[PDB]
Design a protein around this ligand. Structure first.
Ligand SMILES: OC[C@H]1O[C@H](O)[C@H](O)[C@@H](O)[C@@H]1O
Ligand SMILES: [Mg+2]
Lengths: 372, 372
């Protein structure tokens, strides 16, 4: 196979596909990532090769509310944006496919250009979910409303149905309306970096990791990070491990002596020594914590994060702070950490979810499915 | 579920030779950590991997192990590596105790991994990067220096490894290398971008000149200047020059039939080339051989003379075996012309490519490792 990968332009979406890209190359197939400038570093940082492509609102709980007027509008608008940019850049992807001649397209569920390109080239399309998938309804309807015409002009019935949907989300966390996909085990890929000497052993302190993310914090500003540091550092006996992009290190003005800043250290190298992960939900951070059986305190902000956070809380594996009212309330935030630290039930439920993940077939096992 | 500690020599090409296997391991749900001194960090990280932190050329006597000069070179190599092993042992023992690997994947020359395996009673799977000339002088000196060490810790001597993995085409492997299990070479030549000029050949006879950092650091400009002069002077030829960024300044008054490739992984464009001129390092050469592309080989050191001689004996290339040949501008030019005029060279290289593709892929080896 010659697999052309068509991700959304968000590092976290491409990172979710990295172990599969490796599974393919290790099984003797060829892989190329169509990457806008925003994804180049992510792609190359994973050892992969690319074809260049030119390319107070938070928290917003309406993203987790597709039945409301605002929820439906946000997901329609997301579809409209990706549909418009798909048309704008279709000439570029058609040139690429002519140069490289993929036999199959591995396409993020939200990267609609990949479905168009599949239709127009008569290439099979394997969609890939990055995690919780809330695109049924508003997003998917709007994608068809906008792209069906375009495909019908090319002689198709409309935007085609994909060959297969790969799904790394444990079923217990998946949106109830996401159509059934093909399970694939989440393998944590959090980038390269070095094993911290401290990351090997537990401490007598209560180790609480805060891991927010470049893309979240650029959207939100520093509040979720700083409110998390204030909640974690207040409780007696806690050791905060603050996992940050290099540029966010300076927001950290005054930390207790035992706090650790972990700059560009892949979470998975140390997270088994932590009792709680405080995060915004849904990305590699959260799935690595769930893979490793670590409960989470989730402050959702946008997209699929409210869904992930609710679903995690419902499974008993963490707590959700659902909106600005909750996340701004230092008492609810600190009480939430104390709650998880004082009830081994959260870790038990997180272990159950870990078991859901590890019972799914690994990316190496999915390569045969792609073949077929 | 394995935890694999990878113990390479501090040379990037030897780590790159293991990268597809490392990715096969992580894609099948195992954990991998690369013990990396400073020299290897960026190669490891550039592959998406994680780390634990730790004259005169050409010299034909490397390919003359039945001579005194050849024995001394290989004995001095082993002496250097053995003393390093003793220097670094405390760090490796700390790391093993911290991270608790279940299996060591060790470069054939990284004697520390074998010491570590004996002392810790962990299985050692040795990994060849290609042609393995370590059987005479090298392996004897390694036993002379390290058997005592291992005897002080209660062992018979430096242990026999569990398994040797070998990606070298069997017809090219040194006759005295102990039997190793086949693993199919997967080209990995770093990350980078697919160049537009890499999609198709042109009317010209495209010759790639590809020499790595370690080789040019050792040799100086001479093998590069010699190849650029011989190639670009030949009627018909377009030279694609693939050298590390810091060696690009060596190329002045570049002719109009030369292109400097901008850090572009060989495998992205090599299928459009009719010849590769290289020093015989396994990543460049095995990528060429995998793709059925003949080579003109200017060996310099270590295993390069053996590969060069054996490739030529195969009909798949021409060897310039020493300085008098390599500096013979007429002979060099005539060698390029001879390959470009005789499709038998490419046909012989395809025979070798068939030995490679008969081997199981790295993904298939993960089971063998699981059983060890
Ligand atoms: O999937 C079912 C429920 O969860 C969703 O994610 C929606 O946003 C909400 O409209 C719905 O009531
Ligand atoms: Mg043999």
């Amino acid at each position: 196979m010659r697999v052309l990968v068509v991700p959304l332009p968000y590092p976290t979406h491409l990172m979710a596909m990295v172990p599969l890209c490796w599974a393919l190359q290790a099984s003797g197939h060829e892989v190329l990532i169509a990457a806008p400038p925003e994804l180049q570093a992510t792609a190359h940082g994973a050892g992969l090769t690319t074809a260049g492509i030119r390319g107070l609102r938070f928290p917003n709980p309406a993203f987790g509310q597709r039945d409301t007027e605002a929820g439906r509008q946000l997901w329609e608008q997301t579809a409209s944006n990706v549909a418009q940019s798909s048309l704008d850049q279709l000439p570029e992807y058609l040139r690429l496919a002519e140069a490289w001649r993929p036999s199959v397209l591995l396409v993020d569920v939200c990267a609609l250009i990949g479905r168009v390109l599949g239709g127009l080239l008569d290439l099979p399309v394997v969609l890939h979910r990055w995690g919780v998938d809330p695109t049924a309804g508003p997003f998917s309807d709007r994608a068809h409303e906008l792209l069906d015409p375009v495909c019908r002009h090319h002689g198709l019935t409309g935007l085609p149905t994909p060959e297969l949907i790969l799904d790394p989300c444990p079923p217990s966390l998946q949106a109830s309306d996401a159509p059934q996909g093909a399970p694939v085990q989440y393998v944590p890929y959090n980038g390269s970096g070095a094993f911290p000497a401290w990351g090997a052993a537990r401490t007598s302190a209560r180790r609480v990791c805060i891991c927010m993310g470049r893309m979240v914090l650029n959207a939100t500003g520093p509040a979720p990070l700083l409110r998390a540091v204030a909640a974690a550092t207040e409780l007696p006996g806690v050791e905060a491990v603050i996992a940050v992009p290099p540029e966010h290190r300076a927001l950290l003005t005054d930390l207790p002596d035992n706090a650790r800043i972990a700059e560009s250290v892949p979470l998975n190298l140390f997270l088994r020594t932590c009792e709680l992960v405080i995060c915004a939900g849904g990305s590699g951070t959260a799935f690595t914590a769930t893979r490793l059986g670590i409960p989470q305190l989730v402050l959702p902000q946008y997209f699929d994060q409210f869904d992930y956070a609710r679903n995690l809380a419902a499974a008993g594996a963490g707590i959700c702070l659902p909106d600005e009212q909750a996340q701004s309330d230092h008492e609810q935030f600190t009480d939430s950490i104390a709650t998880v630290l004082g009830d081994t039930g959260f870790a038990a439920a997180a272990i159950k979810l870990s078991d859901e993940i590890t019972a799914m077939p690994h990316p190496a096992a999915l390569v045969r499915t792609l073949e077929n």
